[PDB]
Write a protein that binds this ligand. Sequence first.
Ligand code: TTP
Ligand code: MG
Ligand code: MG
Length: 373
Amino acid sequence: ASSRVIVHVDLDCFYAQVEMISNPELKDKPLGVQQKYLVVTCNYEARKLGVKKLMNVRDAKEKCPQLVLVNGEDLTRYREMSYKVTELLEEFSPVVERLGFDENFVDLTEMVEKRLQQLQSDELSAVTVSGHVYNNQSINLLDVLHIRLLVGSQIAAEMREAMYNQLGLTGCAGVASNKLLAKLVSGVFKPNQQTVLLPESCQHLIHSLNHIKEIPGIGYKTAKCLEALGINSVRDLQTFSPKILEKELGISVAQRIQKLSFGEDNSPVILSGPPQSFSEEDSFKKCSSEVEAKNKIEELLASLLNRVCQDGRKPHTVRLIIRRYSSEKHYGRESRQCPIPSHVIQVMTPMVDILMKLFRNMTLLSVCFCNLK
DNA sequence: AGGACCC
DNA sequence: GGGTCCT
Ligand SMILES: Cc1cn([C@H]2C[C@H](O)[C@@H](COP(=O)(O)OP(=O)(O)OP(=O)(O)O)O2)c(=O)[nH]c1=O
Ligand SMILES: [Mg+2]
Ligand SMILES: [Mg+2]
């Protein structure tokens, strides 16, 4: 269990795709999915006209006045389609890890190997790639790692075809030897295309990034830290002192991100299975007076109860989350958590009242059920 | 409870 | 507007 073949599947303009399927009249029209003041995503017709992902509505309608907007605040249908995609992938190989609602990783290593043991010592020379080869790299048919990655590209093309034929969804895929690289390479040709990464082009792909924030795993805060240190390019990170990095970011953060800067990433694809929590949210800027609003909490609850039910298992914890107004105090939500009584597991009024007291203990209200069993 | 990451 | 795992 050394060399892996991993695929990262990444759907095209996911919420917009779901809305275009629901209302066929939105096809070939420029479309944005709105949540509050944000155009959270848009179809590719809208991107040709200047609309970017996560652009506020104002900027977006003055870049593109004719933009059709649909409301995407209720995630129900996106969430449903997202699990349909994961399940279809699980049918290929069971170990599928979700990332957000529209990305999945699958470890294809076992599948690839079983396909190779099936071919004769003749048709191995007929193995061909499906889709793009990153950096137009030459294939060496006597290189076993090349052969396995190409069989990985064929599986990926089968997955994308099944998604289209069974669920009507288009998506990109990237095939590589670990999750970092599969995820980086999946986005090289978009929309609705796939690319495979041969090992010799791994430095080319990593150095194609323009800042270390682009590395999945290095977030807003770590990037701000690395900068403070004079680290800006992937190369700066690759060459920087391991010791200074260690005694500055913790040993954990430091040795992992430095590895990532080389293209190295041993993390396993983890079976996501059923979700670990179920929540719903409501935003309203200045609107929570601090008493009048629990009617909101009752609404969040009623939706949640139907979902948490549906699932089969039951939650043993409830949590209440709030955010508060004033100045740009850039992070700071607050939560109170307590167990759910065992009487009340086996519905509304007692839940509403647990919530209200938790409220009393303490722009945004949400409820989250977790600790499912 | 809260932090940091992800989409 | 969701979601994960770690401290
Ligand atoms: C980053 C992000 C994504 N999303 C949602 C909208 C997207 O349709 C879905 C997947 O995110 P992404 O894959 O980044 O975006 P996308 O699928 O819409 O577009 P692309 O073709 O470039 O892949 O997640 C949010 O709601 N909020 C966020 O902050
Ligand atoms: Mg994505
Ligand atoms: Mg996507």
